[PDB]
Write a protein that binds this ligand. Structure first.
Ligand code: HEM
Length: 205
């Protein structure tokens, strides 16, 4: 049946388990520490930089073509938030953590061997970002007592003026992917792995 439905129903438990980290529990209670939050953005910087490198590389893949959504890219939003927190963010002074490196390796290796599985990476990260952004930006601003419009670029999509319409269009796009039900199962298996890789980076904080 529907790939968007398969992924939603198939990853409901993984979404819940990704909050077993104390970083996320406190974030959900409205508690964040500046230093820890900034390291959390560093891990996402490396992840999205790699994912966007690989999605651009595979943009004309027949399966990925209909989910070519540069509107969702986060690398530049992350850089901007990193500059707000650090003043000047030097990547060589803040090299990727062990869990970040394993996540980037997964992205790279998937891109070169099974690029259709990058659909799982797009789903887990971007559809989550679009779904949670408005809520998470308010929680983060309140937790860190942030100035108006600063340090929350990661949660904002200036290229998308209708978030609700885009989320619907995204799920319709997932359902349009030219993949069979067996291939959708492989996309679900990858999505579960992505949730685990996110739990891995959260575990470090
Ligand atoms: C690893 C952490 C997380 C990942 C990978 C993630 C991923 C996702 C994904 C992929 C969806 C889309 C589900 C679907 O429509 O099929 C989603 C939905 C959602 N997520 Fe998360 N999520 C995470 C954590 C959080 C956190 C911390 C919040 C706190 C607000 C949150 C709030 C939501 C909400 C409210 C939705 C549903 C939005 C809607 O239906 O309008 N998530 N998430």
């Amino acid at each position: 049946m529907s790939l968007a439905t398969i992924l939603r129903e198939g990853t409901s438990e993984e979404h819940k388990a990704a909050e077993s980290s104390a970083f996320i529990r406190s974030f959900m209670k409205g508690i964040l520490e500046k230093g820890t939050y900034a390291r959390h953005l560093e891990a996402f910087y490396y992840v999205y930089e790699s994912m966007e490198e690989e999605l651009e590389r595979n943009k004309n893949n027949l399966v990925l073509k209909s989910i070519y959504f540069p509107e969702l890219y986060r690398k530049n939003a992350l850089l901007e938030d990193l500059q707000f927190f650090y003043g000047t963010w030097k990547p060589n002074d803040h090299q990727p953590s062990v869990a970040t490196q394993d996540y980037v390796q997964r992205i790279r290796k998937i891109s070169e061997t099974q690029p259709e599985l990058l659909a799982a990476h797009s789903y887990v990260r971007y559809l989550g970002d679009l779904s949670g952004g408005q809520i998470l930006k308010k929680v983060a601003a309140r937790a860190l007592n942030l100035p108006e419009g600063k340090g929350i670029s990661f949660y904002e999509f200036p290229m998308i003026q209708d978030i609700n319409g885009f989320k619907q269009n995204y799920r319709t796009a997932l359902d349009s992917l030219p993949v069979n039900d067996s291939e959708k199962q492989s996309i679900l298996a990858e999505s579960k792995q992505v949730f685990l890789l996110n739990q891995g980076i959260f575990s470090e904080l």
